[PDB]
Structures are given as C-alpha cells and as structure tokens.
Ligand binder design. Structure first.
Ligand code: NA
Ligand code: NA
Ligand code: NA
Ligand code: NA
Ligand code: NA
Ligand code: NA
Ligand code: NA
Ligand code: NA
Ligand code: NA
Ligand code: NA
Lengths: 377, 377
C-alpha cells in the first residue's frame, strides 16, 4: 500500500505519518517547507522520541517527500491508496485544488482502486470539511466518479506533541486514532494504532470532554498557582482534585449520552491523569492555556460539558472552578487573553462570561462562576 | 407576525431588521451593546439613509430591543414566528445556548406554531452552521420536537452597508435576500424584498462570482491607480473594462453551471456596475480590498471563478489581472496584507501565489498571473 500525507509538521511526522510508515505503508509527505522536504528526501528516515514511562527513540524509515504545490503531488494522488492530512483549517482549503486535480487524473488514468482520504485535524469531522473544499474545486463531470471511488473518512485523533535537526520530533507514548468505518470505500486497511468505529462522534466528544477539559483546567489552575508545567500542576494535590473531579463530572454526561462503560471510563480518566504527569514533555502551562476565548466558547471544552450537566441534573462544581481559572488566564503574547482581560475590566466578570460563553448572565451557573472567579484573586 | 433579530449592527438595522419592520412584522432586536439597546427602546424608531439614484431617508418604526444575554430573549424565542441573525461567525456560536433554551421553553409552553430561523450572514449556508451550534446546546430530549417544529432556513444576502446617532445607518438602494424555500416549516411568510428559491446555491455563487469578484477587483486595481473610492475606480475606463470583463468571464461559468439566462445575467452585471458608481457611499478601496489572503483562497471570489473557467475552457484574462492586483494590495492596518507582502518578499510571486491559492506553481495560470503581477509594478 501507498499513502500520501499532507503536512510534514510535528503531528505529521510524529504521529500520523509515523503510524502509516510503521504499518509498512510506502509513505510520501507533501509540504511547502523546502528544508523539511529536502531533509526527508536526503535521509529517507528520521527519529521520533516517544516519551512517557521511559524515553524511547523510534526510527521512521523508507519515507520520501514532494511539494504540495507542484505537479508530482497530483501524479501521486492518482496512484496512492490513502491520502491523510495534518495541516490546519487554512491549508486544508489550500490543498483542495491539488486533490481535485489528482482525482481528475486518477479517473483519466483509469485507476479504479478505492481511495480513502482521512483528515487528521483538530476539527470536528475535518474530512467532511475537506470534502466540501474538494467539491469546490472539482469539475462537475468528475463528481459521480469521485462519489463512487473515493471515501472521505472522518477521524478523531489525540496525541500530545508539543513544539538543529528539522525532522526530529518528541511525542508522548499514548496515541489515539479513530476513524468512521462507515465512510471507507473497499477493504478496510490494517494500520496498527488506527481503530474503526460506527460511532465516531462518541469518541470525538469523549476526547473533547476529558482530555481537552482536563488539560485546559490543569493549565489554568496551574498558571494561577505559579506552576511552570502541566506536570507540576497535576502533581499539586489541590489542583489534581479539581482536574480529576471536572473530568469525572464531564464523564457522567458522556456515560449518560453515549453509554460508555463507567469502569472503563474511570480507567480512561486515570490514563489521562498519567499523560499529564509525563516527566519528559515539560509542557508550559502558558502554551496549553492559550486562546482562552476559544476555550470558553459555547461548544468547547468547558461550557459544553457544563451544559450537559444542566441537561442531566448532574454536578458541575469542578467545571465551574475550571471556568473561573480560564477567566483568569493572562498572557502578553496571547491576543485572546488580552481581549479577555479587557472585556472583564470593561464589563465585569458576569457580563464578560455571558458574552463569551452564551450562558444567561442571570443564571445560577454564571453566579457560581463569578463567585469562584472572585475567590481566585 | 413577530420576529426577533440577533445583531443590531449596521446590517441588522439597515437591511434585515429594516425589511422585517417594513413588512409590518413586530420586531425585537437582540444585542449586547447597551447604548444601541437603550436607543432602540427609548425611541422605537430610527432613520435609514437609502442612497443610489437619490438620497432617501426611511424611518423604521415600532421596534424594540432586549439583551441577547438575558432571560427576556429566551421568553421571546418561545413566542415569535421568525428568528433572524446578522452577527458573524463567533457570535453565531455564542447565541446558540440562548436559542436552545428558547426552543426548550417553546416546547414547554406548548407553542406548536412553526418557527423559522434564518441566519443572514456572510457565510455559505450560515443557518445550517447555526443549526449545528444549536444542536450542540440543545438537550437530546428536545431534538425530535425541534426537528418537527423549527425550520433552519439558509439564505443568501447582498447589500452594501459601509461603516452622533448610534442607530442611523446608510445603505445602498439595492438589496437582495434569497432563502431556501424547501427548508421553511409551515406557511411561507410574505416579506417584501425576500425571495424564495429551490436553488439557493445558484444565487450564492452568483453573488460570490459577480458582486464579490467585481467589487474586489475594483478595489485592488483602484488602489494601484491611486483611486480613493470604489466610485473613482469604476469610472476609470481602464479599470472598468477589466472589472466588467472579469465579471463577464466568471458569468460564463455561472451560465454553464446553473443555466442562468445570458441576457438577464448581462443586465445583472450592468446593475452591479451601477452599484459601484454610487456617488453617496464614498467607499474607500482600502476597506473593500482588506483581507487579501482570504480573498485569494481556493474557494473565494478570484480563484474559484478561475478554476471554473479552466473546467469549461473559458477565457480568464481579466480574472488574472484581478489576481495580480490582489497580490499587490498593501495596507499597514491589515495583518493579511502584511503577511502577503512578507510571503512574496520571501518566496517570490510564483511560490507565494501557489501557496495562498492552491494553484500548481508550474501551471500556465500561475505563469500568467506572475507576468501580470510583474507588469503592475
Ligand atoms: Na508511535
Ligand atoms: Na486497496
Ligand atoms: Na459495562
Ligand atoms: Na435562569
Ligand atoms: Na443555571
Ligand atoms: Na430597504
Ligand atoms: Na406562522
Ligand atoms: Na432564456
Ligand atoms: Na500543468
Ligand atoms: Na493552467
């Protein structure tokens, strides 16, 4: 099997491309960074430091690379079995005309072997979003053929990969890659570390409501307590209790909503606490806490679980502490943190929280959050 | 009939709310800006300067307002026949928990009169996007009832409304408001100035490929020629020829793709040229040209029509001039224009264009654009 992966950044090299190459798939990266392209074509391999219990150095080999903006990438799309991405939303749109030209060429070459495309992005159903972009660049006369031969498979991915050698990358031991089984065309690939499900949204929300929720609250409370790193914060027993409790509160929602087994979910929470303890990552709380306006939005990792607890009459006291810690995040380098500070300064925490989150300013939850915010100054 | 409109900004007051109130609908605005809320509740009316052939002053009356973040807005959602928005993508998410709470209350009050929700946003199928946000905030036990009783109707809207009295607004005479007939629940409303179609995407693309394309190219070529305003630029016969020709080239694509009548489309192009001639707007080319990276993206108003001309073997020379003018846009106040300048400076126009647009750097169209770019310095 052959795969083309767009985005040879830390995620592409240390997680998605790594798993593809480790599976024995002939892997080509596509990128615009010439230094990374040349390094991959020069050495055909690189080292990934996989760190958690111990530091392991894994070697990824037999890889090569092409420019995402040239003609070779189009030729490859006409030949490979899988196309994956880890590029972010702006570049996810930019690669669409090359993918569309690739699909036209695939049809013109008479390659009817099923192709599956999997966007591995920090987005909900990113591959469906990519499909939208590809449709916007594909000729009408190719659309039927593409519907028949090409699967746009959504995924949910989770691996902590923080910021001489332009190819080395350090990643945590843990990873999760789950894809929607029902969208694949043809025989399902056997890629170790990739799991197929009929219920992708359950896993998307699990990750959002557990990993993202816990990680953010660890960062926000940690910064308030003067902790440098996620590890320092999670080993602080006062902070740990609130982080664990918030993931448990959000977990009761997931259990009710999706039917996850309670004992396995408890173990998944323990596994995430261990991930935060990683002694090799030295992940700055300021990095993890960045963009608090996004992280305080209605559909995101603090308000959505809270709305779930309201839906089911479940307890949210630790979530409320998390929201108050988020509201306290300050960073000179973060424009959202600046906007946040200015909004609370101008309108007060109650109006500010309502305006960012969409919670009614008169509500009991907003009342509870404002109390908690006041208590942390 | 009763309507609630979220977003009492220039678009809400001068276009969407104006048409609703002019139709005799009892209109309430929802916003977070207390000055605008108080002015609307104090005076219950305001003046809209409608300018084109002449300057007309219209009065909008019998309106009131509530906070989008309080409890009265929830009560209103349980009572009104229509909810409209003009808030932008960030606030479109933020209003979702209030809408969801409103729908729960609508069900709990036993109001089974059909409700239709229409987001009037500079987005493709914004109401479908809003629906996604509302679903993320609505209890599972309300979802069936909402599917039965509530329509989320996509729209395509077009009115040029550029930047003492906090309520007055100036708008061009022309407006267009088209909505997807097939998504309405119950009897269709009679709102003058709102048209219902089975084929909304045809109108979305028409506006993107004609108004947006023409308006952007007028701004970009105008700025290069030292013209202050859209009117100054469009009356420059050299610029006008390129703007008209680009809208015609994009128009041949729309005619082939959607079956628009060629004579009516020619007249629609003439109508847009007249809109650019408006002598009362004094619209700065720098404002209209802002965000060139967005405007040079694969799915946007310059590259998508170009891809269409490639699809159908149609002529794009004027589109190419437009792309080269966009690539020349400079503004200190515009971070994208800064990013653009830095990218061309670092990588050269060919690589820069390919990296922003997704066109193959080796392609003839990229070659043509680079020539044109070089010719304009
Ligand atoms: Na691995
Ligand atoms: Na295969
Ligand atoms: Na069980
Ligand atoms: Na309340
Ligand atoms: Na409450
Ligand atoms: Na009007
Ligand atoms: Na009605
Ligand atoms: Na005709
Ligand atoms: Na070519
Ligand atoms: Na070409």
């Amino acid at each position: 099997m052959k795969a083309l992966h767009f985005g040879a950044g830390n995620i592409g090299r240390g997680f998605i491309g790594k798993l593809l190459a480790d599976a024995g798939i002939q892997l080509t990266f596509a990128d615009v960074n010439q230094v990374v392209l040349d390094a991959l074509n020069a050495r055909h391999s690189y080292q990934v430091h996989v760190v958690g219990e111990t530091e392991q150095v894994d070697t990824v080999s037999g890889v090569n690379a092409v420019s995402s903006i040239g003609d070779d990438v189009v030729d490859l799309i006409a030949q490979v079995d899988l196309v994956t991405t880890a590029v972010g939303p702006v570049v996810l749109e930019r690669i669409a005309p090359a993918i569309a030209k690739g699909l036209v060429k695939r049809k013109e070459q008479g390659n009817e072997s099923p192709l599956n495309i999997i966007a591995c992005e920090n987005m909900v159903r990113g591959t469906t979003q990519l499909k939208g972009h590809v449709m916007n660049a594909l000729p009408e006369d190719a659309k039927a053929w593409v519907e028949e031969h090409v699967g746009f498979v959504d995924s949910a991915v989770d691996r902590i990969v923080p910021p001489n050698d332009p190819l080395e990358v350090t990643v945590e031991t843990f990873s999760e890659w789950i894809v929607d089984k029902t969208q694949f065309k043809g025989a399902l690939p056997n890629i170790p570390g990739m799991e197929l499900t009929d219920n992708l949204m359950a896993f998307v929300e699990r990750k959002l409501f557990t990993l993202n929720t816990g990680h953010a609250i660890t960062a926000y409370l940690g910064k308030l307590a003067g902790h440098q790193t996620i590890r320092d914060a999670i080993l602080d027993e006062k902070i740990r209790a609130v982080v664990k409790g918030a993931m448990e509160e959000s977990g009761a929602v997931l259990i009710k909503r999706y039917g996850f087994d309670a004992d396995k979910h408890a173990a998944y929470i323990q596994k995430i606490l261990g991930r935060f303890e990683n002694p090799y990552l030295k992940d700055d709380v300021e990095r993890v806490g960045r963009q608090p306006l996004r992280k305080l939005s209605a559909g995101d990792r603090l308000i959505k679980p809270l709305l779930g607890t309201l839906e089911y009459s479940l307890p949210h006291k630790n979530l409320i502490q998390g929201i108050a810690g988020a509201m306290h995040f300050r960073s000179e380098d973060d424009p959202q943190a600046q906007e946040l500070a200015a909004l609370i300064a101008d309108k007060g925490p109650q109006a500010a929280l309502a305006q960012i989150s969409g919670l009614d300013a008169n509500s009991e939850v907003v009342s509870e959050a404002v109390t908690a915010y006041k208590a942390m100054q």
